[PDB]
Amino acid sequence: KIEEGKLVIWINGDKGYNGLAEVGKKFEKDTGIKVTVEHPDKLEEKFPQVAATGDGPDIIFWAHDRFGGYAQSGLLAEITPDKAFQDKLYPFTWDAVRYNGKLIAYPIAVEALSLIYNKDLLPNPPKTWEEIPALDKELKAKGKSALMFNLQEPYFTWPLIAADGGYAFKYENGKYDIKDVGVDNAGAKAGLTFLVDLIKNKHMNADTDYSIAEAAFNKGETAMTINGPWAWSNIDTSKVNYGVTVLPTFKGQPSKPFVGVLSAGINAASPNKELAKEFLENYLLTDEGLEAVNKDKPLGAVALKSYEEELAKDPRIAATMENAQKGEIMPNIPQMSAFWYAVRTAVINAASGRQTVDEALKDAQTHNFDDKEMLLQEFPEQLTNYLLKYDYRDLEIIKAVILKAKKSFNSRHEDMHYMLEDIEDEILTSLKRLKKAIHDRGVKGQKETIKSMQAYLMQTILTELEETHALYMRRKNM
Numbered sequence: 001k002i003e004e005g006k007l008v009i010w011i012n013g014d015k016g017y018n019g020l021a022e023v024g025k026k027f028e029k030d031t032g033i034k035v036t037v038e039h040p041d042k043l044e045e046k047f048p049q050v051a052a053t054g055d056g057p058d059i060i061f062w063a064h065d066r067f068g069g070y071a072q073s074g075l076l077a078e079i080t081p082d083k084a085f086q087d088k089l090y091p092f093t094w095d096a097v098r099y100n101g102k103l104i105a106y107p108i109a110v111e112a113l114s115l116i117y118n119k120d121l122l123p124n125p126p127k128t129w130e131e132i133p134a135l136d137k138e139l140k141a142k143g144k145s146a147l148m149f150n151l152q153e154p155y156f157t158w159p160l161i162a163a164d165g166g167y168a169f170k171y172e173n174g175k176y177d178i179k180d181v182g183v184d185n186a187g188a189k190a191g192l193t194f195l196v197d198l199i200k201n202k203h204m205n206a207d208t209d210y211s212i213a214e215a216a217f218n219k220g221e222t223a224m225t226i227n228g229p230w231a232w233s234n235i236d237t238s239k240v241n242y243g244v245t246v247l248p249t250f251k252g253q254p255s256k257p258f259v260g261v262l263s264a265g266i267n268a269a270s271p272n273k274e275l276a277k278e279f280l281e282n283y284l285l286t287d288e289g290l291e292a293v294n295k296d297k298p299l300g301a302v303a304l305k306s307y308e309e310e311l312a313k314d315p316r317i318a319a320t321m322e323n324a325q326k327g328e329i330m331p332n333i334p335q336m337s338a339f340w341y342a343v344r345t346a347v348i349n350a351a352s353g354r355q356t357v358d359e360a361l362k363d364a365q366t367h368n369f370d371d372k373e374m375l376l377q378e379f380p381e382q383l384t385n386y387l388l389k390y391d392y393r394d395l396e397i398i399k400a401v402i403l404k405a406k407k408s409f410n411s412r413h414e415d416m417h418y419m420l421e422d423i424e425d426e427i428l429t430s431l432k433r434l435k436k437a438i439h440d441r442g443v444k445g446q447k448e449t450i451k452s453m454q455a456y457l458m459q460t461i462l463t464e465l466e467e468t469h470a471l472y473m474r475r476k477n478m
C-alpha cells in the first residue's frame with residue numbers, strides 16, 4: 001500500500017535489495033519514517049500501469065532506458081538537486097537520466113556486462129568469440145562446457161550483435177533517430193548468426209536462462225559466462241575461483257555491450273516527494289549507504305565520485321569500466337522499451353527454429369515504433385505536451401475524434417476555417433472535462449476508458465467550440 005509518511009521502494013531482484021533495506025533502517029532510525037523495499041516481478045512493466053491509478057511505489061529503481069517513457073507519461077517527478085550535490089556524481093551519469101533537459105531520476109551506478117571465466121578450468125580466457133567452439137570440443141571431452149549465458153534476455157546477446165556494427169538507433173545531431181534502426185544490418189546479422197551457429201553445433205543450448213547459466217558456472221560445469229556485477233556475490237559464496245575480463249572480440253572488433261545506469265525515480269504521484277529527495281540524497285548516495293547496498297550485491301562502478309575512487313581499484317570494477325568504454329550507453333528514448341521487446345523475440349526466434357536469422361531480424365527492423373512526437377506533429381505544441389500522458393492506443397482514439405470534431409465544426413460554419421491552433425484551448429478544457437467525467441463515473445462504480453468515452457469527448461469538444469463561436473459572434477456585434 002502507498003500512504004503518506006511511509007516510503008515504498010521498488011527494485012529489481014538481482015540487485016542488492018537487502019542492502020537497500022538496510023539503509024531503510026538507517027533512515028527510519030533517524031527520521032522515524034518506515035522504509036519498505038520490495039522486488040516484484042515485471043516491476044518496470046507494472047510501474048506504468050499502476051502509476052495511472054496512482055498506487056505505484058514512491059521510488060522506482062531501474063536502468064535509465066526505462067525512464068524515458070515514464071518521463072513522457074509524466075510518471076516521474078522533476079529532480080531538483082543543488083549544484084553542490086550534482087557535482088558529487090559523475091557528469092556522465094547525470095546525462096543518462098536527463099529527459100527534455102529535465103533531470104527525472106538520480107543515477108546510482110553504471111553497470112556493464114563482462115566476461116567471467118573459471119581460472120582453474122581456463123588458464124587464459126579467450127580473446128575472440130571465434131575461439132570458443134574449439135574450446136568446447138576440448139571442454140566437452142572433460143565433461144564440461146565452454147560458455148553458458150542466458151539467451152532469454154537480449155541484454156546479453158547484444159554485445160555480440162552490436163560488435164561487427166549492429167546498432168539500436170542512429171544518433172546524429174544530438175537526437176536519436178527513430179526512423180533509423182540498425183537491427184537488420186549486415187553487421188548485426190553476422191553477430192546473431194554466429195550465436196545461432198553455436199546453437200546449431202550444440203555449443204550452447206537455446207533454452208538456457210539466467211538461472212541455468214548462473215547455476216552451471218558456480219558448480220564448475222561450465223568455464224565461462226557473461227554477466228554483470230550483481231553476479232559476483234553469489235559466485236564469491238561458491239568455491240569457484242573466477243576472473244573478470246574484457247569481452248571477447250568479434251571479427252577483430254570489440255564486443256560493444258549496452259551500458260545501463262541504475263537510476264532512482266521519484267513518483268509524480270507521491271505525497272512524500274520531500275522524503276524521497278532526502279532519502280536518496282543524504283542516505284542512499286553517500287559512501288556509507290552505497291557501501292551498504294554494495295555489500296549485498298555489487299553495484300559495479302558507482303556514480304558517486306567519492307566512493308568510486310575506492311571501487312575502481314578492484315580489477316573487477318575497472319574490468320567492468322573497460323567494457324563500458326568499449327560499448328555504448330543505452331538511449332533513454334520512450335521507444336527503447338519497444339526496441340528491447342522487438343529484439344528479444346528475434347533472438348529467441350533465431351535460437352529456436354522458429355524462423356531464420358534473416359527473417360527474425362527483418363521483423364525486429366520492420367516494426368513500426370510508436371511516436372507521440374510524430375502523432376502530435378501537426379497539433380499545437382502546448383496541446384501536445386498535455387497529450388503525451390495518454391498511451392499510444394488511446395491517442396489514436398483522441399486524434400481521430402478531435403479531427404472529426406474539427407471537420408464537423410468547419411462543416412457547420414462556412415465563414416471560418418479554424419486552424420487546429422485556434423481550437424487548441426477548447427480541446428484542453430475538453431480533455432480535462434473528460435478526465436473528470438471518467439472520475440465522477442469512476443465513483444458510482446462504473447469503470448470507463450477513453451475508448452468507451454469517445455462519444456463524450458466528441459460532444460464536449462463541439463459544445464465548447466459552439467460556445468467560443470457564440471463568444472466571437474457577440475464580439476463582432478457593435
Ligand SMILES: OC[C@H]1O[C@H](O[C@H]2[C@H](O)[C@@H](O)[C@@H](O[C@H]3[C@H](O)[C@@H](O)[C@@H](O)O[C@@H]3CO)O[C@@H]2CO)[C@H](O)[C@@H](O)[C@@H]1O
Pocket residue numbers: 012014044045063064065066111153154155156228260336337338340341344
Ligand atoms: O521483459 C521485460 C523488459 O524487456 C526490456 O528490458 C531491458 C532493460 O530495459 C534494460 O535495462 C536491460 O536490463 C538489464 C539491466 O540493465 C541489468 O541491470 C540487469 O538487471 O539485467 C537486465 C536484463 O536482464 O535489458 C533488458 C532487455 O534485455 C525492456 O526495457 C522492458 O520494456 C521490459 O520490461
